[PDB]
Symmetry: C3
Subunit: 684 residues, 3 copies
């Protein structure tokens, strides 16, 4: 057990990031300086060619690979490695001008002009041909270069196209999904409503603000198609990569939504993950903002990490972050001294085998010229950003034992992108209080405050290995998923569900005749009414001797065999069941009918931590704001003690451990400065 599983051939933590010398070809002095600064900053891995298509192919069929040949050799000579990217992220101007079909058509059916990035038509045969060919040339030339470590396919896949080519592709997709049965499609989408019944496949179109946007089934299936065809585009990209370089691992960088650090909503990453070799993503938390504590934000980062790592049974790769500040936030505030080191260590602690940045060197002009990078316009090593990057680099060098290490969890939180889509599109409840990913984080809080390892999983992930499965607001759920949940509980698993779960099937079709028999058996109860509240509306639930504030949502509950653990205290359903528990088979099922304050989640899950013996990898006594995360090797535990507060923090090491950096045995109480991290080692 605890066997190491490696994502790449590297036996060291990758350090570096996006490199962009194709912007500096007129400046050989800068290019030479780059190599020296890479040594000084202790960076070793660099992602090259993300937006270099116009530099590789300035005219159609005219190729310039020489500058890239030199970059490969130079990086390798200083002991570095290259993550080679496919350039599909931004088409050259000559391509858009000559082949207009690569330009997107938005939902309002407006054809776009050339500009920006990440905005190609995902159906266009021309762009599929062009991207695959340039990928083939790259694979042919650099495929066996010793510096090549990894493929970085495209850049931040996202967006939709509604052109005629995509409409036809969408129609063929629908024909396959519904086995050419128009009756089945009409039944699934309930198109009898508002006389929307389709009588020919040619009538079906993608959703539009100037067309049809009132059919949930259509909206949901469209999002599914967008994901499938994006993946299709990706598969077309990697055809020569698989042929010519089967041994080189393939990834594409995932995102978080531009807001609240919730999972990217544009693409079903759970489906995407199965086509990748390793998971990678770009993190840009708004550190030092004035609407939440540093700890709250860190908790959100930990949540996303626990989601993206759990997509595979292996470490992930932080493909991008900023060493200081970004350019596109409302308030572009830079990391305070110590914060970069702290955030980097957190990334490692949650399972990253890399600390990669955007950028290496700041672009001199254009949109992201003020985005953070290792090297500022001043070209100085004197910068506090450069110095802390170097500090991270030196730390990472001493942490090669952590590479490949996993970190098993007994607690799982179930997240579903299709559920997120359906719930967001649903007409009902309250639009601004749905907050499905945020609600999951609320159930993630007590475990993060208790340093208990959590996996945030999706439905194709195995449930059997976990003692505790939490599935808040599973509004959309299939009979197959339900059956697997029933099996999970019956075999001894503990399941927690909440208000607005199992309302709808995979077609956003409402379950009829009360709630599904399985869920009713498992939970020993059933919901009969969802009460949506106004911002000033309040209620409370009395549970284990305490009344907890309720907001936004409440559920009227019909009890069968379940035990009533909590009751409402106000409104017309006062003194009726609010929290339930039910023994089912060898396991147990809990239902939380209302959205309650943080303290409820702390106390409720405290009971389960005790009942199920849920413990941290290494117990460290500390106040709130201090996070303790560990990765587990066969011979030892690597534990990160991270102070996400602006205060000194007294923590207590109950067991003797060794500082990974100094080798010093430490035990008992120690003081942590602001943003200070202690990385300790504990032999089994």
């Amino acid at each position: 057990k605890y066997e190491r599983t490696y994502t790449t051939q590297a036996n060291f933590i990758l350090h570096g990031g996006d490199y962009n010398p194709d912007q500096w070809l007129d400046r050989p002095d800068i290019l030479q300086a780059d190599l020296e600064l890479m040594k000084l900053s202790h960076t070793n891995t660099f992602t090259v060619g993300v937006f270099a298509w116009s530099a590789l192919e300035p005219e159609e069929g005219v190729y310039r690979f020489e500058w890239l040949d030199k970059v490969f050799d130079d990086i390798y000579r200083i002991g570095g490695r290259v993550i080679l990217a496919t350039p599909s992220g931004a088409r050259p101007a000559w391509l858009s001008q000559k082949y207009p079909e690569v330009l997107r058509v938005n939902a309002a059916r407006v054809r776009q002009l050339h500009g920006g990035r990440h905005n190609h038509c995902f159906t266009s045969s021309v762009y599929r041909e062009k991207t695959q060919h340039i990928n083939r040339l790259l694979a042919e030339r650099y495929g066996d270069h010793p510096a090549l470590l990894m493929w970085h396919v495209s850049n931040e896949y996202g967006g939709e196209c509604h052109c005629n080519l995509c409409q036809e592709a969408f129609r063929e997709w629908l024909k396959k999904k519904y086995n050419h049965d128009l009756d089945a499609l009409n039944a699934a989408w309930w198109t009898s409503f508002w006389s929307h019944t389709y009588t020919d496949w040619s009538q079906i179109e993608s959703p539009s603000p100037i067309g049809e946007h009132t059919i949930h089934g259509l909206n949901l299936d469209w999002k599914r198609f967008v994901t499938d065809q994006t993946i299709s585009f990706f598969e077309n990209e990697i055809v020569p990569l698989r042929e010519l370089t089967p041994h080189i691992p393939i990834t594409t960088n995932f995102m978080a939504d531009t807001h609240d650090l919730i999972p990217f909503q544009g693409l079903d990453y759970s489906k995407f993950a199965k086509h990748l070799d390793v998971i990678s993503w770009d993190a840009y938390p708004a550190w030092h903002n004035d609407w939440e504590s540093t700890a709250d934000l860190a908790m959100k980062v930990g949540f996303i990490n626990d989601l993206y790592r759990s997509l595979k049974q292996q470490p992930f790769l932080l493909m991008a972050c900023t060493p200081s500040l970004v350019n596109w936030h409302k308030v572009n505030k830079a990391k305070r001294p110590g914060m970069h080191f702290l955030s980097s260590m957190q990334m490692i602690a949650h399972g990253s085998d890399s600390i990669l940045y955007f950028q290496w060197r700041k672009s001199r002009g254009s949109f992201e010229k003020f985005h953070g990078a290792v090297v500022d316009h001043d070209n100085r090593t004197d910068s506090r950003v450069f110095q802390e990057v170097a500090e991270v680099g030196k730390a990472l060098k001493k942490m090669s034992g952590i590479v490949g290490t996993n970190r098993p969890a007994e607690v799982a939180i179930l997240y579903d992108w299709e559920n997120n889509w359906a719930l967001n599109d649903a007409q009902g409840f309250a639009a601004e209080t749905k907050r499905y990913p945020q609600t999951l984080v609320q159930h993630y809080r007590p475990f993060w405050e208790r340093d208990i390892p959590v996996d945030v999983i999706t439905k194709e992930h195995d449930f059997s290995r976990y003692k505790l499965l939490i599935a808040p607001m599973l509004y959309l759920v299939s009979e197959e998923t339900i059956a697997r949940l029933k099996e999970f509980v019956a075999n001894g698993g503990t399941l927690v569900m909440t208000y607005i779960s199992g309302i709808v099937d995979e077609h956003d079709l409402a379950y009829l005749g009360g709630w599904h028999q399985d869920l009713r058996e498992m939970f020993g109860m059933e919901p009969i009414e969802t009460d949506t509240l106004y911002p000033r509306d309040r209620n409370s639930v009395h549970y284990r001797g305490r009344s907890y504030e309720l907001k936004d949502y409440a559920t009227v509950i019909k009890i069968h065999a379940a035990t009533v653990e909590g009751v409402y205290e106000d409104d017309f359903y006062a003194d009726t069941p609010a929290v339930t528990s039910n023994q089912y088979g060898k396991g147990q099922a809990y239902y939380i009918g209302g959205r309650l304050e943080d303290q409820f989640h702390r106390d409720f899950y405290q009971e389960l931590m005790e009942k199920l013996d849920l413990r941290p990898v290494l117990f460290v006594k500390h106040e709130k704001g201090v996070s303790v995360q560990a990765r587990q090797a066969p011979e030892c535990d690597y534990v990160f003690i991270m102070n996400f507060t602006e205060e000194k923090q007294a923590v207590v090491l109950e067991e003797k451990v060794k500082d990974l950096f100094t080798g010093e045995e430490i035990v008992g109480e120690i003081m942590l400065d602001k943003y200070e991290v202690r990385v300790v080692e504990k032999r089994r």
Copy 2:
């Protein structure tokens, strides 16, 4: 002037947090007094929800007793009908969560159904009100 009878659909945001129930009730009365006065006759409530709607910012359902209250108010201001959208909740698409007499669970046990029954039971005793007007000074 081109219609035989006036009819309208009423969807007041009952139990909101920016005004009293009385204020909202007053506004409902104003609209009723307007649409009734378009002709010299009773009007018809063509649609209202026995519980909630689907398209409000906050879709809060009527509290116990409010539906009976609102229905009686409609009659009082000159409506010779209590008609709902919808009879039975559609299983899918845009208004699958719009209020109806029958929920997705098909139960007469529902408080929505029982109160609709209370209203209809009261309406059967009020046929004398049918056709009556209400002159104003």
Copy 3:
């Protein structure tokens, strides 16, 4: 040449009147006859005619109706009035749009507009440039030698842009000229290597768009430059027959302030347009009596804009439009209180205007601006408090002919740059809502306005040498040439003040590399190494002159060389590090302010400079805050305006004995000012 008068027109009096639209009342002889009578009673003598009269002049193509305008000319002339004749390109007739669709605009999203509104023509269209020049020539032929003609009013409030195919190719030609047909130089200037945007043919380049390219700053900046240049080109085409047939009739076009907080108009580089005009004119509509600022604060903002537009040509300017009561297009259209109109009118004169002109003379009966303020309301009454206060202004103006042509030299200058405003606003960085570049300049303007010290708000085309003190806040974009000029300015004895987020970028929005420009580093004896952008709730403070001042929005980590540390931060990770510095360079001095501090810092900091450089008002008058004292200077005397921009009575002390301009009595000592009361005062030299 000392304090020599500079006349903008052949008028030896202050112009009073405004936009007159008799073409809306041609079916009303009674109204037109009543106009002249009320004009006399209101003491108005100058009227802008024909601004939107194209359809009245040419109802159908080739069918002209000049008779009504002939009579208006002779009628205004009869009562001793003058005519500011306007070219009608501001609103094309419906037949013109229908017959020549190429004059219609195409917006940024590439949508062709339909006919409607105003000011929305294609500024490239050869047809529209031709038609507009034709009708201008006809006007110049028929009215050029009429004695009532005073000045040309070309078009109306130039603004907006077009993205049609004609404009696209015009933009490409403009780019070829600017970059010497060197596609390499263009790509290098815009840094198009980023996101693989490198252009390989000129045909690939197009104007920015929300559905196209909007992420290339160099393109966005050069596009705005092109919009200005081609607007100017359109203007130059309009005035060809004007220069030819009427070479001695001065030409102007009315400038604007932008919709909110009275900042300079951002649609056009007025610093470039000004050079193509004989005299500067602009339209002022301050939201008087609003509930988010004091009357004094708003008046200060008005003073700033006035000082800016006046300094563009160093001669009196002309208030082309203001409302005698209220406007129609504000969120809250509140009318001026009694006294306020007289007060604001006097403030215009005090800051260099040789005219008080209104929009409009008589209210429109219908359409968009029927509830806009005017001298004559819909009731056609003279009992109106609006009409009577207009008459009060006119009565006062007739006694102020000596002020006509007079200037007001300043020792203090604040540097403003439109292209800097553009590039800074488009930049991805800092905080979008707290950039506030022109508002920041006003904050540095405040201590001098409170001390009645004359200030010129200049642009980089303006000479620097004549000033003792030049303030250049947030000069984010600056060229090598400008830096050199600032260097020489300080070296020769000038005192320069700059702030956070200056000299980051050159005229291509290209970041300077290798730390800060050596010239700036030598001048200031220091260098900025990091800009700290803050959230709304973030706070810091700077210790300076034995006192702490609050800091918001922005701070700057500073590396000291030769400079003297005069202020240090007190919080965060750069606590007890330099925040305010001073440095001697050549005969002069350079100050750097690394943080955005409260108003009281600016008061104290600039008080030091007022003492050190001996900066005094023209005539010192003792008063509390809210009283503004501004002066214009003649060879023989100073005309001093004492204005109460508060809603309470105000005690004021005149030191030197002085002559009241209206009632020629001499006054001295304490004087009591009522609410909104203005005292116009004369001090012989």
